[PDB]
Amino acid sequence: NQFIKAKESKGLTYQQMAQLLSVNKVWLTSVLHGQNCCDIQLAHRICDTLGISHEYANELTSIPLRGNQNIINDPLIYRFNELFKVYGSSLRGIIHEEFGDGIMSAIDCKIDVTKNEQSRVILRIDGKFLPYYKGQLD
Amino acid sequence: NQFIKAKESKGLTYQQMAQLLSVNKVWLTSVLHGQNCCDIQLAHRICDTLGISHEYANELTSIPLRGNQNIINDPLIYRFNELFKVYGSSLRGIIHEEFGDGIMSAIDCKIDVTKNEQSRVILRIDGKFLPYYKG
Amino acid sequence: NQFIKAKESKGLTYQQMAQLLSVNKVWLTSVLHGQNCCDIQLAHRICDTLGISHEYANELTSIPLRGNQNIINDPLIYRFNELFKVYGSSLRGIIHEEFGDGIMSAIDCKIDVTKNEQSRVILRIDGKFLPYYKGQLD
Amino acid sequence: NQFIKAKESKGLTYQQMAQLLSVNKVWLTSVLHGQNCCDIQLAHRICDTLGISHEYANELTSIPLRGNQNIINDPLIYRFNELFKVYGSSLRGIIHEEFGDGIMSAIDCKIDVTKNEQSRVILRIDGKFLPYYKGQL
């Protein structure tokens, strides 16, 4: 939020910042919002890109206590939740059939989000498949 | 589930069924799971593809109660929920900046899911942006 | 609430403000309550209409977080919720039969509210019908 | 649901049934769904309109337990909820200013729902305003 305010002053888009720094747009956005962290060298570079002093680079490096903002009621966010309420079992079935018994990780995961021709929201999620342990003794 | 049992007997994948019927794989899967419905002509073709009788086609046509299966605890599903707990505010901010004040619809929405080389799960969601009424 | 306090001072009704500004009464009311936002030019005009300085116009422009005021227990609001607990399935059935498989949007939506003869509360809701995706490839 | 199945067989719309019986469409629909009840004479008439035997008229007459079907997650219904989450305080303020300190009843209430030109869903709710007791002895 000290970082967001600084970004608005400069007239920078999240897209622009990501391209200047050569990093994933959604991840970088999450670092600035404090749901993720970076190494110190990127932190210094973020500070320069924005107006701010290198004394704030520390905050971007601290691991955060994540996933704890109550935002469930925001209509934009609810829709993503509704989407997995409706298609969840289908995604479960498809993933089981095509990858096997496992899950898609939320940790090793690259989100991308894009406006395409026709102005539709295109959200691409790219996650590691982790198979479940199968009881092997060595 | 009468439809899923029928599908397993034949050794059909969801992919295969979708390509035979020329429809979105995820949507079709959701019709078979009863979270979505189709018109009668597709319903007959589904039945036609599966072992089953055309007397079943009615069930695929009924608008079904939606979003009411308590699957929150399944680890696979939880992860998608966790993902929006973590990146939700970021997505919100990006969408606001790049589209304006609105939302991405869950109704007019095309999911796609894919194994890419390197065996990563690739989930693509394609939704209509609806702007808020402005006075 | 700085806006509401200002409105009460002047003896303005929500009706009056809406007619002066040529906007939907309910929507404008929601802007003042911080559940919706406007463009900067309307924001300046709202400020002039009320007592207040144009330095507050910024707050009316910021997109807020929406739907997160814990007002469920207020009897006036509960009633609306009870109303859809009782008639919900009926509205669902009628809409399905007369529009098809879809929903009525809460986003593209015009509320209107009126005292009619006999002093009855007349609430009119005017929403876009969005049909569900039907699996078309092209 | 034994009533809904009967209606579908005949190819009747909720609109048609309401116009034949000279009653509010939404209310009637709610009687058939078991969220409301009618008198015995209307119940018999509903039974004739549909295929069914009068022996079922009793179910339409019993006052049920209301508002207890867990339909919150249906996207269509959620939207109406979200709508009052967003505009609730505004409606509260407007009603207070234009009627006074009270509420709009959900009991004495006429819903109406309509497809208008352009295919927009037009829901009209018509409720009694009840003012709060003001402490008069």
Place this chain on the structure above:
Amino acid sequence: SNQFIKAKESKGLTYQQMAQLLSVNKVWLTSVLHGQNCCDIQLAHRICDTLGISHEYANELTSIPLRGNQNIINDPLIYRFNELFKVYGSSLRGIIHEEFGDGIMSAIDCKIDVTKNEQSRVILRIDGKFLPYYKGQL
């Protein structure tokens, strides 16, 4: 709400006494002072008059309050009233249906009264309008 209460305790006034001085229902008045109900400006000035306080506070008593939102469920005194309707609720429902018809007893148009009788029993009298459900007429 406490500010009024504090003023009442100073003067050694009972809720009973205040109600009789002002010619209003005791329970309703008490609820105005607790901020779960409001009065008109003339009664507000008189309340301020009865208590120590300045007329400048009369405004707070006139604002429609955001009701029913004090988390008092765990107080044993309050829990019992809730338990009471858990146990006798269906019976009251059945009796009211048989003797009044298909409707409800309003919580809006409602006069509570509460009294110590001989034998020291708590006597709570609730007097509410019966509202019948809409019967589909035109």
Place this chain on the structure above:
Amino acid sequence: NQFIKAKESKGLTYQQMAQLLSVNKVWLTSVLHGQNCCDIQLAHRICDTLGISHEYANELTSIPLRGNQNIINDPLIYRFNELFKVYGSSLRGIIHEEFGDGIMSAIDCKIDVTKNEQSRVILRIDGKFLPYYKGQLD
């Protein structure tokens, strides 16, 4: 419910049954609904009053698991709950001032419910006041 069905057959009101048996109307109603129980001699008399066989009197004598019917959403019952959300703190304050530090029991409690001259629902609750233990020894 075997008891309620039997009552409807005979065309008996809860009022009538209570007057025939010389017992509180609301309490009796609760016995028939299985939220309360009676002694065997009353149980036999209830059976005689209704069509039914005496053999069945035992069900009326069993102590039942109370307050566990999920009726919270019924509009008629909700209103009673909303009523104590709004006036709860007021009733707590009045009872404290007029009886002292204690509660009104839900166990030793006589409900009465009545249609008055004005066709208003009149609900009278008559409960024992129990004061809190004050630390005295033996």
Place this chain on the structure above:
Amino acid sequence: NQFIKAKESKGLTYQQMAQLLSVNKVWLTSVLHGQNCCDIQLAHRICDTLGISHEYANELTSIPLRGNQNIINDPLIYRFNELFKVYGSSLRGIIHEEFGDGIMSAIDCKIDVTKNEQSRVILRIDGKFLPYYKGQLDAGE
């Protein structure tokens, strides 16, 4: 908590305070924690027993808004809750058989808590049995 701090300074145990004042240990403790209240004469005496001024005696006299401290997650307390989850129905059945259809009051109730030989926690609860109303008509009709 001003009272607790004062008690810790003096090195007083809840046992000691109770014996000096001739009152139930657990009840007194609950007064000091603000889940119960006393009369003014005991309040003055509590104040003297602790370091504190008689001026604070008022707070001990106010009726409190009880039972509203969110302590459910404390392991010590959770155990008591688990205990009634496991034995609740049994206690219900025994009380019904030996007293009748009623309850044991939490209002007219004397708790006592003790370390006995063998260092076991011994918790004794002594409550009034209240029978349910049995439908008797009042004097009127």
Place this chain on the structure above:
Amino acid sequence: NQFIKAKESKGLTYQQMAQLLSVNKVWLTSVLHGQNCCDIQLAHRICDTLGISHEYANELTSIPLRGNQNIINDPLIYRFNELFKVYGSSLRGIIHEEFGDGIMSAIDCKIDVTKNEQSRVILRIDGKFLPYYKGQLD
């Protein structure tokens, strides 16, 4: 419940059964209710005391899935819960002072319940004190 039905037939009290078998009354009651289990020798003896066949003895030996009967709303049970809501912090403080930093076990625990001379419910709970681990390397 097959065990309870058998007990009611014989006219046995929980007290009597306990005395005959030389076991804690509350614990035995819990075995019959399926919140606890016994060894096979006691199980056979329970079966003989009641009318029933020894084949039913195994059910008493199975470790049950405990603490999962939704009895929170029963007024008799709620009161015990309320009691620890009100006196919980006091008990916490007393135990800390007189035993140290630990807890009273619900596992190694002897309940006893008794009607005294004054017809008061006397509930005695006798539990092992377990001190928290203090970080010792040995």
Place this chain on the structure above:
Amino acid sequence: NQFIKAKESKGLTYQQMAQLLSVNKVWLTSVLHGQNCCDIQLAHRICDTLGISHEYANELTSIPLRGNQNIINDPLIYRFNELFKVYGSSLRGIIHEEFGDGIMSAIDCKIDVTKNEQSRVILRIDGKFLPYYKGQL
């Protein structure tokens, strides 16, 4: 539960079954409980080990909707939950310091449970550390 009943008949311990089949004791136990699944060849072998027919091997192969048995109130289970309520933030801190910003997987995870020389319950959990995404592109 048809599998558990079969096991109790034969007087087999979970330990014994695991050693006969050369698999992790806790995982196998979870297959029999229906919180995990195995391949068909192990499924047949499980059936042989127990009394039962190879027609039941199918149930052991189905992927199950996991983590949905309401066992939170069982005292034994509660204890494990309480343990992470108390030490959770400490484990979080230690793992951050010693492995970095990530998590320990519950998917690639080997539980082991043992009675030691001192008759103490020794639970050993062995999980993969997954670090969070770096933002690479």
Place this chain on the structure above:
Amino acid sequence: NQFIKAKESKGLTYQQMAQLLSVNKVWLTSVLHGQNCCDIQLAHRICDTLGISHEYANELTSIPLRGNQNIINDPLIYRFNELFKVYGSSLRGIIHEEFGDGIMSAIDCKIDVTKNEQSRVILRIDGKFLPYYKGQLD
């Protein structure tokens, strides 16, 4: 958190602090996080090891109200929960078979957590088994 900030300044690891003070690493970490407490002599030593003044030693000595930090949504912590959702019944069964009818204590319990050679998280929990009371009168 005043303790954690102090630890980060000095560049101390939890491992180092534990080795220096001769205590269990996880337990000490919990003391710093306020989910456990120590005696005054260790508290003083902790203060020296960190930058801080001996006036803060008191906080480390207070018995804390445990298990009440709302950290359920942190992905790292959720996983431990999910783990017992999946394997809970299995652990229950194994422990019943190999120890008997009881539980593993969370009170008398030594956690240990370790990076092994292959960089896997190895969490070792060492708890007392407490058997349930078996109804004995001796």
